[PDB]
Amino acid sequence: IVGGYTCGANTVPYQVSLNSGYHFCGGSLINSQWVVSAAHCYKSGIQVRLGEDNINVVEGNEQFISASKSIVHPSYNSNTLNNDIMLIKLKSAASLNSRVASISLPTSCASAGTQCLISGWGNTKSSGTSYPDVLKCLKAPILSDSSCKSAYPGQITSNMFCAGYLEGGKDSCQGDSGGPVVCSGKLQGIVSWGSGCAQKNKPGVYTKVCNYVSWIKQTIASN
């Protein structure tokens, strides 16, 4: 997260870190056994780290739970990043508590201008790399589809939205992928992609979770 702020430990209790011996993506806990992340975060060997704040220090409240299933959306296109959503089933249900909590899926899509919280342990620099220890947060609005498509012509599918800032300086960034964009208590987005990070006129692009709620529910229900 570039241009964000330290969330505060466990203030984003649905934020998970996907770890493969290092934090590589975020995710969002959507129930005690399932995490939503980005399909492009798929890999083997995912350990979901819940309850994290400092991802480099065991501070307490962490639960590290292996992924038992990582379900990339069947129509994920790794070139266009359409359907950039993955569900991870935890090998065991997380113990939910104030620091490890699910986030609700949307019941409807969010409108442009909806303010959301994007969080992650991604790079905090728009140029160069600095990976934080602690979870970073960014309040960011969903941009209009027109602005999003203007920023990323031909690249924004109906399953994506832009959020953030066009003036630069505030965005999700590498290492934030898969993590949440939560708006009014609903997981509306998954950090997916963008042209660089926090670049002027290049807002973050996020998987539009509301388009996947049924898929998520159906997939969870069948797994």
Binding site: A38, C41, L81, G122, Y131, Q174, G175, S177
Partner: peptide
């Protein structure tokens, strides 16, 4: 560009 590490 995807935002993974």
């Amino acid at each position: 560009c995807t935002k993974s590490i």
